[PDB]
Amino acid sequence: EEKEILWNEAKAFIAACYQELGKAAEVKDRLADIKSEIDLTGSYVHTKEELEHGAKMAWRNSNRCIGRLFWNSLNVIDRRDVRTKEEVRDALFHHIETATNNGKIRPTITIFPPEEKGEKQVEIWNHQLIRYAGYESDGERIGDPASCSLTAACEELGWRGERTDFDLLPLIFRMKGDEQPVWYELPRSLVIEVPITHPDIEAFSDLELKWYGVPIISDMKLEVGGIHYNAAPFNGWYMGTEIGARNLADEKRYDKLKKVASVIGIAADYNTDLWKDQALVELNKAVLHSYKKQGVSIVDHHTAASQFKRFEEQAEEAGRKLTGDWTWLIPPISPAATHIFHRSYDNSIVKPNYFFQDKPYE
Amino acid sequence: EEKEILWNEAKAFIAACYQELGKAAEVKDRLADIKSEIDLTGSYVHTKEELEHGAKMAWRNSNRCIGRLFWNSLNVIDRRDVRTKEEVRDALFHHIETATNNGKIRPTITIFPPEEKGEKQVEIWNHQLIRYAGYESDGERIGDPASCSLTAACEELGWRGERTDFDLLPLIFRMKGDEQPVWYELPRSLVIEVPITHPDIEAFSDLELKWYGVPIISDMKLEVGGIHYNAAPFNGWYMGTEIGARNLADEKRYDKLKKVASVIGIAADYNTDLWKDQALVELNKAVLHSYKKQGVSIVDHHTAASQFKRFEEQAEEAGRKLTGDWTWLIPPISPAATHIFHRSYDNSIVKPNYFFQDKPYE
Numbered sequence: 063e064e065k066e067i068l069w070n071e072a073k074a075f076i077a078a079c080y081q082e083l084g085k086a087a088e089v090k091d092r093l094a095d096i097k098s099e100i101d102l103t104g105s106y107v108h109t110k111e112e113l114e115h116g117a118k119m120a121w122r123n124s125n126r127c128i129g130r131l132f133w134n135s136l137n138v139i140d141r142r143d144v145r146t147k148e149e150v151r152d153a154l155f156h157h158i159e160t161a162t163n164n165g166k167i168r169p170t171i172t173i174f175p176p177e178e179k180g181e182k183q184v185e186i187w188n189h190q191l192i193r194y195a196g197y198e199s200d201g202e203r204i205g206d207p208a209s210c211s212l213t214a215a216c217e218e219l220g221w222r223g224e225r226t227d228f229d230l231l232p233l234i235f236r237m238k239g240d241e242q243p244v245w246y247e248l249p250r251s252l253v254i255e256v257p258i259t260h261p262d263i264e265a266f267s268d269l270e271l272k273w274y275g276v277p278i279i280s281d282m283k284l285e286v287g288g289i290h291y292n293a294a295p296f297n298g299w300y301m302g303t304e305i306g307a308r309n310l311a312d313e314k315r316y317d318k319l320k321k322v323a324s325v326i327g328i329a330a331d332y333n334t335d336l337w338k339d340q341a342l343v344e345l346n347k348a349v350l351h352s353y354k355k356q357g358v359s360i361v362d363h364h365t366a367a368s369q370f371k372r373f374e375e376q377a378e379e380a381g382r383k384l385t386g387d388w389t390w391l392i393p394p395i396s397p398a399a400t401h402i403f404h405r406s407y408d409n410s411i412v413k414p415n416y417f418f419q420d421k422p423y424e
Numbered sequence: 425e426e427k428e429i430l431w432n433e434a435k436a437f438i439a440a441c442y443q444e445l446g447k448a449a450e451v452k453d454r455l456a457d458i459k460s461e462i463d464l465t466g467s468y469v470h471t472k473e474e475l476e477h478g479a480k481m482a483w484r485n486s487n488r489c490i491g492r493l494f495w496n497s498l499n500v501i502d503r504r505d506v507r508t509k510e511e512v513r514d515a516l517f518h519h520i521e522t523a524t525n526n527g528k529i530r531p532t533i534t535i536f537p538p539e540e541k542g543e544k545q546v547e548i549w550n551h552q553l554i555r556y557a558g559y560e561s562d563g564e565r566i567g568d569p570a571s572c573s574l575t576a577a578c579e580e581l582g583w584r585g586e587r588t589d590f591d592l593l594p595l596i597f598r599m600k601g602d603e604q605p606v607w608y609e610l611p612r613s614l615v616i617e618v619p620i621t622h623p624d625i626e627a628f629s630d631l632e633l634k635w636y637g638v639p640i641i642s643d644m645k646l647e648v649g650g651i652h653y654n655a656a657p658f659n660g661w662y663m664g665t666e667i668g669a670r671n672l673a674d675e676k677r678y679d680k681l682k683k684v685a686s687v688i689g690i691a692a693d694y695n696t697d698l699w700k701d702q703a704l705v706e707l708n709k710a711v712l713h714s715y716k717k718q719g720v721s722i723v724d725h726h727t728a729a730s731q732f733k734r735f736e737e738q739a740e741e742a743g744r745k746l747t748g749d750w751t752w753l754i755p756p757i758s759p760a761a762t763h764i765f766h767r768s769y770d771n772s773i774v775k776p777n778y779f780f781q782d783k784p785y786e
């Protein structure tokens with residue numbers, strides 16, 4: 063019955079994919095080959111063109127993503143050939159280097175061998191390839207609480223963090239056959255970080271905030287035509303609010319708004335003063351400014367929404383249904399100033415797509 | 425079959441209502457009386473206690489409302505006795521006066537006779553009892569575009585607006601039996617308005633913004649135990665963002681952000697400057713400040729969310745399911761700074777409730 067589900071997802075995908083590629087004539091023959099490949103082997107192997115287009119369709123179908131206008135320029139790196147932990151480590155280091163591109167960030171995905179029988183070939187433990195550690199013990203809170211459990215798991219494996227608020231977590235992943243993952247410290251030369259300064263409030267530097275340049279999500283599953291690529295890390299550039307309104311601002315993350323309020327010189331005493339809102343705006347201006355100043359790609363939420371409107375228009379012109387999750391598409395800063403807020407979106411799940419999967423730790 | 429639906433909604437309501445009122449023993453007898461009243465007459469009449477508690481339950485069940493903590497202190501005025509247009513007009517003037525309460529606003533609802541056979545007894549045309557007119561002709565845009573169609577309908581009836589950006593619309597309503605509604609100009613003595621000034625930017629006054637004190641929604645239907653009170657205007661006090669982030673800010677409403685940006689002295693040239701966001705925060709500070717300074721009730725969105733959290737806790741403690749519409753509960757300014765943003769809500773519709781109904785104009 064496994065062959066059955068797989069075959070159905072493959073027909074649907076190849077038909078859709080080849081139609082978009084203008085290769086509609088080649089479908090019947092490609093599907094034949096697939097059909098006997100599934101029979102003989104229990105699975106099938108994507109061509110480089112299918113895998114590339116699939117990863118691109120999956121981004122286009124990600125309901126939560128405002129950045130989708132650029133789906134068709136995704137840089138797909140095919141690493142289905144890897145067999146050893148050194149190869150994975152080097153594929154992961156290369157992805158960081160090439161996606162970063164000296165600050166001019168290239169949306170990239172590196173695709174590792176897929177699941178075989180539900181059996182993972184490579185299992186990445188990181189939530190993002192570049193992320194800060196978090197520690198919580200004896201009342202003390204250091205670093206990013208979102209990382210606290212993975213940080214504790216790395217420290218079970220003989221890694222030790224310096225316990226700054228910005229320790230980079232090592233890459234950590236497990237190969238099939240191994241009972242424990244291995245970890246490798248990131249070469250600092252590969253990792254761009256941006257110190258947060260404000261364009262006109264000189265004291266803002268006193269907070270000593272920084273963030274890393276590239277969000278490289280490494281814990282989702284790419285599903286393309288029934289094939290499950292559980293290890294396929296991908297990146298874009300940040301939208302400023304992700305850093306300024308959530309990572310640095312959330313009470314359960316870095317929780318910096320009171321400190322922001324103090325350095326910009328406003329009281330943080332009365333809700334009616336809207337000091338959180340004012341602090342949020344200044345922190346978000348700082349973030350955009352700082353990335354720009356350092357020559358690292360970033361997009362503000364107004365420009366991002368204006369790009370997403372073009373994505374909507376493009377979908378319509380192409381005859382494609384648009385899907386989206388309004389609750390994640392709206393930015394957390396001035397959402398009613400974007401067109402997104404004032405319309406609704408069909409939150410249907412269309413495949414190919416990226417999916418959440420269970421963490422091997424916790 | 426009409427008796428059938430009505431009877432079912434009545435059983436459900438009386439049982440629930442009397443249980444909450446600790447009058448559970450009186451249900452069987454009250455339901456008997458109702459049953460024969462529906463038989464004889466085709467309907468039934470609520471007791472003053474049922475009608476009051478029903479209006480209060482309806483507020484408690486309004487999924488879109490963040491202000492619900494205070495549901496049980498709603499002031500219910502029973503005006504089911506009205507039969508003439510002078511009586512309706514005076515009930516409506518009284519509601520404005522008593523709800524305003526010299527600025528210390530009292531959440532109030534005035535309940536008019538309900539629909540009889542689907543036939544309305546009184547049909548209110550206003551969306552709110554106090555609202556500004558809107559005009560759009562020959563490229564010119566004056567006043568509130570949200571009012572443009574009702575404004576045009578009033579002007580068909582011999583009313584003429586002065587064409588300021590803040591003309592008060594007359595009360596306009598139709599009595600059953602009349603083919604046309606009547607209109608009555610609001611006595612300005614009854615209507616509190618608040619000029620918008622900023623606590624520390626003196627030039628803000630140059631915009632000459634103002635807004636009215638009390639939002640009195642007059643176009644929804646109150647449904648209680650199968651009875652349809654299509655005319656039952658109700659009010660609370662504003663949450664500042666309704667005025668500052670939407671009525672004064674939306675491009676399709678007063679559209680004031682560019683003007684705000686100019687008077688607070690920031691450029692409105694680059695999305696990455698976050699000038700809309702900064703303008704929004706300053707406009708919203710001004711609004712809160714101005715209401716407070718004038719002694720008119722208002723609540724900021726942080727305090728409102730903190731009150732709503734208590735409503736959630738109270739619902740849990742009482743064993744009541746909570747319902748809510750996340751998409752309307754989040755404020756349009758810094759939504760991620762409220763707890764509302766970080767949880768989900770069941771958007772089920774529970775009765776008694778307030779419902780949208782079709783406008784008689786347009």
Ligand code: HEM
Binds near residue numbers: 169171296366390416
């Ligand atoms: C090019 C710049 C990009 C920007 C500015 C962008 C922006 C965003 C934002 C703001 C979110 C919401 C995240 C949150 O609030 O937690 C998001 C979610 C997402 N984006 Fe994009 N994105 C970009 C590129 C990409 C790429 C290249 C892919 C995949 C190939 C992708 C797939 C997704 C997915 C799957 C989610 C949902 C993640 C989850 O469920 O946790 N995005 N994006």
Ligand code: HEM
Binds near residue numbers: 666
């Ligand atoms: C006491 C102060 C109150 C505050 C601060 C408050 C706040 C709000 C807010 C902010 C909204 C969203 C409006 C929008 O974005 O369009 C809303 C919706 C609503 N409120 Fe309240 N509210 C209050 C009192 C009341 C009262 C007294 C009732 C009824 C008895 C009520 C019933 C509703 C209803 C029915 C809606 C949805 C209206 C619609 O569907 O268009 N509220 N409230």
Ligand SMILES: Cc1cc(N)nc(CCCCCO[C@H]2CNC[C@H]2Cc2cc(C)cc(N)n2)c1
Binds near residue numbers: 299301304
């Ligand atoms: C590629 C990319 C570019 C860009 N600018 N931004 C992103 C953001 C992806 C989200 C990253 C953080 O997501 C974490 C924190 N919020 C949700 C959590 C991920 C998650 C968790 C769970 C339980 C489910 C789910 N679908 N996704 C991705």
Ligand SMILES: Cc1cc(N)nc(CCCCCO[C@H]2CNC[C@H]2Cc2cc(C)cc(N)n2)c1
Binds near residue numbers: 659
């Ligand atoms: C009582 C009260 C207090 C307070 N602070 N705020 C309110 C706000 C009620 C909403 C007033 C404005 O609503 C208008 C503009 N947005 C939605 C529209 C009303 C509406 C329209 C439609 C088509 C459906 C619907 N359910 N409601 C009500």
Ligand SMILES: C[C@H](O)[C@H](O)[C@H]1CNc2nc(N)[nH]c(=O)c2N1
Binds near residue numbers: 391
């Ligand atoms: C965290 C919680 O699930 C909440 O409902 C959602 C909704 N809105 C969001 N929107 C974005 N872009 N990112 C998020 O993490 C969340 N959180």
Ligand SMILES: C[C@H](O)[C@H](O)[C@H]1CNc2nc(N)[nH]c(=O)c2N1
Binds near residue numbers: 751752
């Ligand atoms: C206007 C459009 O329907 C949009 O989806 C909604 C969602 N969020 C909202 N939230 C509130 N409080 N008020 C509104 O008018 C809207 N608009």
Ligand SMILES: [Cl-]
Binds near residue numbers: 277304309
């Ligand atoms: Cl992030």
Ligand SMILES: [Cl-]
Binds near residue numbers: 639666671
């Ligand atoms: Cl309003």
